[PDB]
RNA sequence: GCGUUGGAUUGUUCACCCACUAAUAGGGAACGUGAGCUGGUAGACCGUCGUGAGACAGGUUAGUUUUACCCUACUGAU
RNA sequence: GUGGCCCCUUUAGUCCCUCGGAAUUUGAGGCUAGAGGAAAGUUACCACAGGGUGGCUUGUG
RNA sequence: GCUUGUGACGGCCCGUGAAAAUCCACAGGAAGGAAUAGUUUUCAUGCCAGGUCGUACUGAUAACCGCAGCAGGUCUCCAAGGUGAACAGCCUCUAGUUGAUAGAAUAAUGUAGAUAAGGGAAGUCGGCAAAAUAGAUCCGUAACUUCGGGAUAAGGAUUGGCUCUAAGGGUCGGCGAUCAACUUAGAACUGGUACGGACAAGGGGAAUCUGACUGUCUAAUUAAAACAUAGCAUUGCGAUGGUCAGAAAGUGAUGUUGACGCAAUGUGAUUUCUGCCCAGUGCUCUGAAUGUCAAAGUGAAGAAAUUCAACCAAGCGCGGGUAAACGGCGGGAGUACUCUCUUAAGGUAGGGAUUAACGAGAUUCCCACUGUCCCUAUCUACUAUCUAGCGAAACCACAGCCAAGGGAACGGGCUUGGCAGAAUCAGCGGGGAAAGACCCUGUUGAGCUUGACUCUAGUUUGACAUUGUGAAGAGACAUAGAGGGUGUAGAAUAAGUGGGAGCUUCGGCGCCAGUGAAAUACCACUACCUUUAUAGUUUCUUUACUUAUUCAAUGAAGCGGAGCUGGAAUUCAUUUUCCACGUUCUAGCAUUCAAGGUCCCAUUCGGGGCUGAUCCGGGUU
RNA sequence: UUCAAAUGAGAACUUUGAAGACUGAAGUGGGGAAAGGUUCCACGUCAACAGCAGUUGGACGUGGGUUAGUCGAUCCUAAGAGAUGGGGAAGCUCCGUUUCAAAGGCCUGGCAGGCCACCAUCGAAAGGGAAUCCGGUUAAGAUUCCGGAACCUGGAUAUGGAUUCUUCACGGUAACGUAACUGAAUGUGGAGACGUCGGCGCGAGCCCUGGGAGGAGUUAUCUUUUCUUCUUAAC
RNA sequence: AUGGUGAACUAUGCCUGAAUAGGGUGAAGCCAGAGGAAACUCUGGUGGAGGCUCGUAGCGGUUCUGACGUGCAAAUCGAUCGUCGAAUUUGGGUAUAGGGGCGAAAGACUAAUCGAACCAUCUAGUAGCUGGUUCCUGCCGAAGUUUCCCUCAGGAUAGCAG
RNA sequence: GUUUGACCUCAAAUCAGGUAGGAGUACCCGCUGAACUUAAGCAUAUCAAUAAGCGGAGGAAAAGAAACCAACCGGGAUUGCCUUAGUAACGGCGAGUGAAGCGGCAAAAGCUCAAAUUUGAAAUCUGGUACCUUCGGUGCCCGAGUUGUAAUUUGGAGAGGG
């Protein structure tokens, strides 16, 4: 048989991301003495757009303490920040939107974004548009902190891990229909080559497990296993269930 | 996914089984719903009547409770608090209503109790008191005659679940405290003379076959069943002692008195005429196979057979094959002579057919293989007449009798039949 | 010896229908394997079957052979 | 009158042979005598190599 | 007015539409600089030099690629006048070319066009093809409709030329003077067979099936109801990760990513509909014990090789879930059969179905129109034809008149007959030329599929090694013990079997007496069941440490502990915890071993140290 | 397509002239990129080729011809390619492009004390980019040569000018202005540097057109007539 | 099978650039007027949206009993047709390489080669079946179930002749 | 003495002087490693411990003076030839594969380290430098080296003491 599309996706010839017009990798400030003990102030200069991304970014300028110079970080903007705003980042920072704090300092019930799975990760969770995590409780002994993620899962992580207050901007982006193939074309033009998607049923047997037949059908049971391997995993990888909910 | 997670239980339980210190509020959010649901369930095509249902569509409340019961039964071990009364709620949901619950919910609770007993949350001593009372209630004849009562299916489910329970309990070592307790309920069911010992016999046979209840205490139960008045209980006992018999005969307390009581109660005593022929024959088989094996003496058997020993009678080849099985070396051969002379008068007489004569001779020679001095030389010769009979049934039959008496009493045979070694043995031993 | 038509009908025509007409006769030279010009493999869909690849009791649709200038015959011409 | 009418499994060897440097004891192999008895479909998307009147009839059951 | 450049604006995006070299300015103020004279080369002038390689020509119906001086293909700039909406079509200016084998005739058949009386689809599988319509102004425009369209719907009145009228503007003057363009409406007269006069330029309508649409593909026979699409639904995954690569790697894609995301599938706009089954096959479950149960490891026998037994992970088996998973289509009860009754895929209403637009998609009918046809005729151009010059190819056993016979149903050759006169030109397509599919077979070649056979990457679970330092518990081997038995009756809870009528502390008692299949004292046998202890033997679970190992980050910057210091803080007498001397109205600034204080030297135009800024540490975090 | 003449042994095809037509500014024109490579131009010149012909030719033989500080490459980086260090691999070689390196360049005053922080290279003759225009000239070359007139870079530098005894300029309320009017480390900002469509405005060139000064053409009749020249570069 | 060469055609992605007359319809926003107590409505204008439309260049390749058929051409010519401001057309640079790539999916394309490219070697590869196998004369001279290996089957044998 | 030095380890230099790469590759030393074919089709098998691929040398390479063959009255490094032998043996015990000792011959060749106290004298060696009779010698000076350079000893033996 042939090698199939998902197997070809791993080499990364024509499936690499399209990264020319991206403003830069969005990240939090590196964990330093200031963020660990007190706070530090920066100025948000520009609220800007990032190609291939629905959420906007913010350019935040901070003052290097060890040398006389300026350092520009690229944050993911939360809903409500504005140019000329002061962003306070650290342990002793106040509880306002856009500020960066550790999860142990804040109380439970608060809303944060761009959370680090571990301290020094510089942003892992709640980065897409309209997304947020909710702190539900702390455990100061054994220092840990329990959070709820956008998928609904509940996790426990270090209280020294950081996050930025508020909701990521750009919400509602998926409530608008596209109505046209051209808008999907231009959307994925800047993300990657995962569009259009031909159906495996419409191919020959060399090209897919689902291919073949005088009628467009699958010969079996679209729930594949998890111990399957590299050419068998067509659809519904490890389905605990199927059907409408 | 977050808003749908409360609706998706299969993902919730896999998440809870990982980190159950989290997902406390997610569990309370469902336990409250389960409580509010059980608090509810606690309490035709004609032109006139309301339309009926197909039997497979259900309510959205029941479809939710059936899911919540499984979720709570699978995470009770993670949340021992807030679930301590859950199995008692299930138990008093079952054995106080029995009827305001749909069959799917009943089945779900019955399986959740079984897995809650597989895990050591619940004990067998309190699961038995849930399972047994439902059998008698769904074998009621008044509960099983609704519109869509699933009484037969429930009676099968509870039965196989009891079997799984006892198989579970008797794996490592035999839980005598449990077996001795649930044999007492079989005894106390067989007392109730209507039909309720069915669920004792049908269960003890299964456990004997699975080898879980090899004990002297159990064979007494089936003895009492065989000595019962109900036909489908007596038959269960008889077919147990049959299954050629099984090792249970070697755990009886008095086989002779057992056979005597059987022959007196069922067949001869009152002549109630309850059993049909197909059951009378199975009783005869048991009696004769006990008798021949254990050297018993009743002497009424051998006149009871004579009514039925006629070729114009229904399925006589089974009766006469049990006639021989009640013969010995140690019984008065006159009461068997009358039997042999009935058979000879009615099966190898004038004009009879080939199959009839062959059946007669074949069932006489296998009598004489146990009771050799039960027919005399004068009729022995009359029957070895039929050696060269041209029919190939009677010849094969007569040769068997000749070879039987060639090794046992060859002087009854004539010189023509003593085959080269019986005659030589007689010639040396006659001088 | 001389004539033996014009048309309708493809949810079909191994044929029938109404008209005109003097008449609207039957056949062969191909169909005793296969031979002018014209209607009646590759792609795709529905149905039956098949675990499936695919096949068919089917049905629908679209879908590139291209002489003669040679001999003979025939027709006319030296 | 010396009867009748038509090939891969297993066991055993007095003092059987050998295990090749000699021996003993186990095993193994022999020669004897016994007892038993690897593998399914499809291809019209295809390719290759080969092959392919008895004068017969007519209108009458 | 055309082309082009530019400016300020507006609209569109789940699209917000390169980087670096190079140049400048600003902040800052190290520093150096005038006095009897300096400073400034970002003001003006003046002086010197600027290397290597390319540079012609075509850029195409003859300079490139197609075997070629091949009607094919191949990126781009400039672009006049008139008609006219127009870079359309027609004619012309500048510039360029006048190249493509020629001459004579005008037969058929052809190729490319054109016209035709009356009838108008009688033709034909089929109105194929052709014809007809066509531009602009005005009137008018149905059903249906996703209310946006359908729609140029349909169907009708007109169009020339010439002479006129009216209206539509700008600049200056305290209504006039002056200047200028093509836009429309209207009237009169006039020629006509024709007036969008050539060119140019929709045929329309009533319905059906089908896919929503725009779009895409079988280059070189299939452009479609196929693919894609938006929309719809399902699944996996919270980074120690999901999906996918790589021989390996201190290796990679998604990922400059983080559930409004990535990956994997199916369905295929909107509207309407969307009922039930987890028996089967798949998928899944942090699913007990028992069963099956590999290697290592353990025990027994033996002199040993070896043999046996026990233990034995996952997986299987077992039982729970799931159908917008493949399947599939009823349920229950009473005695597979047989009787019974519920069938909730019920139309919610008798307004339940009268249902767009788009399409080189498949189909029928009507109007109009015609040489499709009756029924053919005529004309034009290039060929054919003849001539000068030039000059191939296919095919070719040998050849070339017919009939009958034999014959593989079938002769140009053989037999018997009919006949038969040179050499030849133009035509024709009957035959010969003379060069197909279909059917079958190989124990074939390849492609594809599957619980066909043998294997395998990958993945998964177990053992060993890497692998070191501690502790606490549970189970088992193995011995030593200790006790036990309710179906019923019987004084009583009778493993069972065999001997029988006292050793006697008591003569309690055992025998003789019921009842029971079996009879109890007393003493032996050998079955099961349950518990007590650990010489030892082992196995297993949990937990601690860090230096191996592993992961990530950084500028390897602030780590760990301190009567630290100073505050409070609440104590039950002395602590324990918080803080720390550092920063939160504001789109500013923060840099020269850091100023100051203090000790010493030198008096210089200034140097060095402590402190400002707590101490220690063989761990960058 | 035609007529005459010339050339020549020979002319339907060559040259000139006289006619008739064509492309008709989205050309049969004038220039370029890729590719080709002398095919360009001249002088001789016909054996073979230009499916007829040939005195002709992109043919044959012999020569000539391509001039740059300003046009380009060169330089920069784009997607991307790829060494080193290190790690794999039996190995040809693979990974990866700042990595887990002691990866080097500035100051002050038997070398002593300080400061800075960072990755080879390649990759566009349509992207970015310092600076030239006119006229004339050749058989064939030109934004390259000749003449004339400018500009950019880099370097050494003298004079004048500006400033200064209030040492490193004045004016203007201000927006800001001028011939200039010191400025190291370090830092910051800007330019380079950017989509597409719609219409509106402004400019250049072209189109159309009038008076006048010149030349050509028509004139059988008419036309104060039809056509044509009257231009102004970088800086 | 082993080892190597190809993205100058073509498929797809990325980078940097370029090209695309004249008309028809007339969406949001906006202006005025009329009717309103006001929600708001009606009329006339402005404006210039659309993966709209007619239709050039351009891209494609529907139909013709079309021309040609050793053709100009190993896919061309003519007329007719689809589309024509965008999922558009395109140059150069770059990336993906053979049981591999790419694929809006036809088993399509991958240098006239694709249901597995091209080059060389192993290689004089090999079954099965076909075709052919070179001078004269003399003498002798046949054969077709007779018996069998899992039925065809390639065979092994009886008999015949030298 | 918070100074001054010695050693160890790791670096840098366009430091002084040398050295490796690549070609050829008939033969040679290794590594890696197929299929066609032949077996009935075919997994064992055969083709084959072959071809292709990689690394590395020389005029020859490799091997080589026994941890050998043997079972004899014992031979006596290695290599090659004749023979052993199409044998012993291996193998769906099928296709097929397949050595060795002995004997005759060609050529002939033996040896070296570590492990031992020089301990009454590191006696050893590279380099730099000045001369010389220059494929090298003498002197002198830095250095290597006792974590061991020379002599002496290599199992056949051998050493020390006499």
Swiss-Prot record, chain A:
Primary subcellular site in the record, as a coarse category: cytoplasm
Numbered residues of crosslink Glycyl lysine isopeptide (Lys-Gly) (interchain with G-Cter in ubiquitin): 45, 92, 118, 144
Highest taxon of the lineage: Eukaryota
PROSITE patterns xrefs: RIBOSOMAL_L2
GO cellular component: cytosol; cytosolic large ribosomal subunit
Record PTM Phosphoserine, positions in chain: 51, 94, 158-159
InterPro entries with a match to the protein in the record: NA-bd_OB-fold, Rib_uL2_dom2, Ribosomal_uL2, Ribosomal_uL2_C, Ribosomal_uL2_CS, Ribosomal_uL2_dom3, Ribosomal_uL2_RNA-bd_dom, Translation_prot_SH3-like_sf
GO molecular function: RNA binding; rRNA binding; structural constituent of ribosome
Annotated SMART domains: Ribosomal_L2, Ribosomal_L2_C
GO BP term, pick one: ribosomal large subunit biogenesis
Subcellular location: Cytoplasm
Keywords for this protein: Cytoplasm, Isopeptide bond, Phosphoprotein, Ribonucleoprotein, Ribosomal protein, RNA-binding, rRNA-binding, Ubl conjugation
Protein family per UniProt: Belongs to the universal ribosomal protein uL2 family.
Database matches in PANTHER family: LARGE RIBOSOMAL SUBUNIT PROTEIN UL2, RIBOSOMAL PROTEIN L2
Complex formation: Component of the large ribosomal subunit (LSU). Mature yeast ribosomes consist of a small (40S) and a large (60S) subunit. The 40S small subunit contains 1 molecule of ribosomal RNA (18S rRNA) and 33 different proteins (encoded by 57 genes). The large 60S subunit contains 3 rRNA molecules (25S, 5.8S and 5S rRNA) and 46 different proteins (encoded by 81 genes).
More about this protein: There are 2 genes for uL2 in yeast.
Function of the molecule: Component of the ribosome, a large ribonucleoprotein complex responsible for the synthesis of proteins in the cell. The small ribosomal subunit (SSU) binds messenger RNAs (mRNAs) and translates the encoded message by selecting cognate aminoacyl-transfer RNA (tRNA) molecules. The large subunit (LSU) contains the ribosomal catalytic site termed the peptidyl transferase center (PTC), which catalyzes the formation of peptide bonds, thereby polymerizing the amino acids delivered by tRNAs into a polypeptide chain.
The name this protein goes by in its record: Large ribosomal subunit protein uL2A
Species of origin: Saccharomyces cerevisiae (strain ATCC 204508 / S288c)
Source lineage: Eukaryota, Fungi, Dikarya, Ascomycota, Saccharomycotina
From Swiss-Prot, chain B:
Location relative to the cell: Nucleus, Nucleolus
Gene Ontology terms: cellular component: nucleolus; nucleus
GO biological process: protein transport; ribosomal large subunit biogenesis; ribosomal large subunit export from nucleus; traversing start control point of mitotic cell cycle
Subunit annotation: Associated with the 60S pre-ribosomal particles. Interacts with NAP1.
Family to which this protein belongs: Belongs to the SDA1 family.
Further facts: Present with 3640 molecules/cell in log phase SD medium.
Record's protein name: Protein SDA1
Gene assigned in the entry: SDA1
First and last residues shown, out of full length: 6 to 515 of 767
